[PDB]
């Protein structure tokens, strides 16, 4: 159903069954599929295609030539009714593509809230993007990629399938990420390697002096101690008993499947 | 002429002279030029521009914001009636661009069948793409490039003008190809260098144990023997008398103009 306070441009095509929330705006030449839900205050500027089983939250700004909920590029995908979920207050820029999940990959592509997805950013099938992330121009996530809260993917950077980009990570522009990136790490290059803790990011996001020091100590245990990851895992958990921000490493290790960038 | 069984959306603009085949589907806000031929069962999802002297085969799926047959980016091009040919069962994804040929380059851009051209892949003037190829997101072919059968171009990879990508090649993502890539080779980097035979690709495509071994032996003659290409050409032809798959090297050498990646 289309809320009486929603605006639907006369040139837009909203298929019967679509749900458009209060004060939403569907701009000229937009196409909205019958299984789409558009939340309150969300704006589709113009020339936007939204289809598939897709739920979009509130106060999103979706710019021209974006494709949200489209059939993914997985050669195994065969038209199964997979899904996309997008949260609130995202800025989804020109030509961004967000594709639906695969049955084999869990059936869902998810994007959280307050993200900025710059021109031609790509979110493949079965990806999970958290909150307050930034994908810079042409940043490309392959299938099944996780981008955790506050992580930044630089311009023209690709992330290999199944890789996890930890919370508060900064991946430099013109990079290729082939393994998992622990939280709070700066990564750069092709293949991307670690270049210390994202100190400026942590400072700006209210992390204490003591928390940043403990995170640097955890980074040193992983990358500078010369010990294996298995030897270092209880050392990091021990450190986390005093500085809870260090628990993000433990949580990340349990999810990691591709090894760590080194 | 528009076949009586073709669907043309009322918002689509199909110019008089265009030929639309049986059970084809021209989606909303598509533009089809007067010199375009769209084969039986081909679908233009929405917001697709097809123009120029362009022939598209059967059962193609062309996604929103794609531009097929458009004026090329060659500064020497001056509006001459050059062409595009696209075969059957291709999946041409969002924002892909396929440009018409140049008179100087032979007048034709050609794409075969069963290809997957991922988001924002670019096929410049006078390119020739074979069958069962994959161009990953943002893969960019400069003018006069050849991409032979089953070749894979990774994400964000550029191929320099006039270069040939041999059959069954795999070019890694985030690469720059500046010279010719012999068939069956893995290439990666900027400028791309060879990293052995694409064994997994050959296995998956039904090549015998004996054929893969002979191809590896031919690779060793080119890259590990320490001999010049001229010394090695009769050695490869000799090997091909027993293993016909090795003839692909001989055929490639005759077409090669940029030297080999090394």
């Amino acid at each position: 159903m289309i809320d009486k306070s929603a605006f639907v441009h006369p040139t837009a095509i909203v298929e019967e069954g679509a749900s458009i929330g209060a004060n939403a705006h569907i701009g000229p030449f937009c196409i909205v599929g019958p299984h789409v839900e558009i939340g309150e205050g969300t704006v589709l500027k113009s020339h936007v295609v939204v289809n598939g089983h897709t739920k979009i939250g509130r106060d999103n700004e979706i710019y021209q030539f974006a494709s949200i909920g489209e059939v993914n590029q997985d050669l195994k995908y065969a038209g199964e009714p997979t899904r996309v979920e997008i949260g609130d207050r995202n800025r989804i820029r020109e030509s961004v593509t967000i594709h639906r999940g695969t049955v084999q990959g869990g059936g869902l592509t998810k994007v959280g809230s307050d993200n900025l997805l710059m021109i031609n950013a790509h979110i493949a099938h079965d990806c999970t993007v958290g909150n307050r992330c930034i994908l810079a121009n042409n940043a490309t996530l392959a299938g099944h990629v996780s981008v955790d809260d506050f992580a930044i993917i630089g311009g023209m950077t690709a992330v290999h399938q199944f890789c996890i980009i930890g919370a508060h990570v900064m991946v430099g522009g013109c990079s290729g990420v082939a393994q998992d990136v622990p939280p709070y790490v700066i990564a750069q290059g092709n293949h991307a390697t670690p270049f210390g803790v994202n100190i400026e990011g942590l400072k700006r996001r209210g992390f204490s002096r003591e928390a940043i020091t403990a995170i640097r100590n955890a980074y040193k245990l992983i990358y500078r101690s010369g010990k294996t990851l298995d030897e270092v895992k209880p050392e990091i958990a021990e450190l986390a008993e005093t500085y809870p921000e260090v628990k993000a490493f433990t949580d990340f290790f349990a999810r990691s499947t591709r090894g760590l960038i080194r | 002429m528009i076949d009586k069984s073709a669907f043309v959306h009322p918002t689509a603009i199909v110019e008089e002279g265009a030929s639309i085949g049986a059970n084809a589907h021209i989606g909303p806000f598509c533009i089809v030029g007067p010199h375009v031929e769209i084969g039986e069962g081909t679908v233009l999802k929405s917001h697709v521009v097809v123009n120029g002297h362009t022939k598209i085969g059967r059962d193609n799926e062309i996604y929103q914001f794609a531009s097929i047959g458009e004026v090329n980016q060659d500064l020497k091009y001056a509006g001459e009636p050059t062409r595009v040919e696209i075969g059957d069962r291709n999946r041409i994804r969002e924002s892909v661009t396929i440009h018409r040929g140049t008179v100087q380059g032979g007048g034709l851009t050609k794409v075969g069948s069963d290809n997957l051209l991922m988001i924002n892949a670019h096929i410049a003037h006078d390119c020739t793409v074979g069958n069962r190829c994959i161009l990953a997101n943002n893969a960019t072919l400069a003018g006069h490039v050849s991409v032979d059968d089953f070749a894979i171009i990774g994400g964000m990879t550029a191929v320099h003008q006039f270069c040939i990508i041999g059959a069954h090649v795999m070019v890694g993502g985030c690469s720059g190809v500046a010279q010719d890539v012999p068939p069956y080779v893995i290439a990666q980097g900027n400028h791309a260098t060879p990293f052995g035979v694409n064994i997994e690709g050959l296995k998956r495509r039904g090549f015998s144990r004996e054929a893969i071994t002979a191809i590896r032996n031919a690779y060793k003659l080119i890259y590990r023997s320490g001999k010049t290409l001229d010394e090695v050409k009769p050695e490869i032809a000799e090997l091909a008398e027993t293993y016909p798959e090795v003839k692909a090297f001989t055929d490639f050498f005759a077409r090669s103009t940029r030297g080999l990646i090394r």
């Binding site: 590029q73 996530l141 299938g143 290729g176 | 990953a136 171009i153 993502g173």
Partner: peptide
Amino acid sequence: TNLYML
């Protein structure tokens, strides 16, 4: 989406 990163 497979970016064929090696």
